[PDB]
Amino acid sequence: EGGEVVDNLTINSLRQAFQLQRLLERDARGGTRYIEIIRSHFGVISPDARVQ
């Protein structure tokens, strides 16, 4: 008694785990202020004034 049961890995679960890791690595490398997120995850240079 008292084990942990985990299901079979789908390839869809496995590729989602890879793309989630890419997202968290982009957040570490790029920064996590809302302007840094926009500039790292998208091509966009937001003005500072409009983001307070």
Binding site: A28, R29, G30, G31, T32, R33, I35, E36, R39, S40
Partner: peptide
């Protein structure tokens, strides 16, 4: 002056 690693600090 470009996008630095670890987010911006001047």
């Amino acid at each position: 002056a470009r996008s630095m690693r670890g987010g911006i600090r001047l």
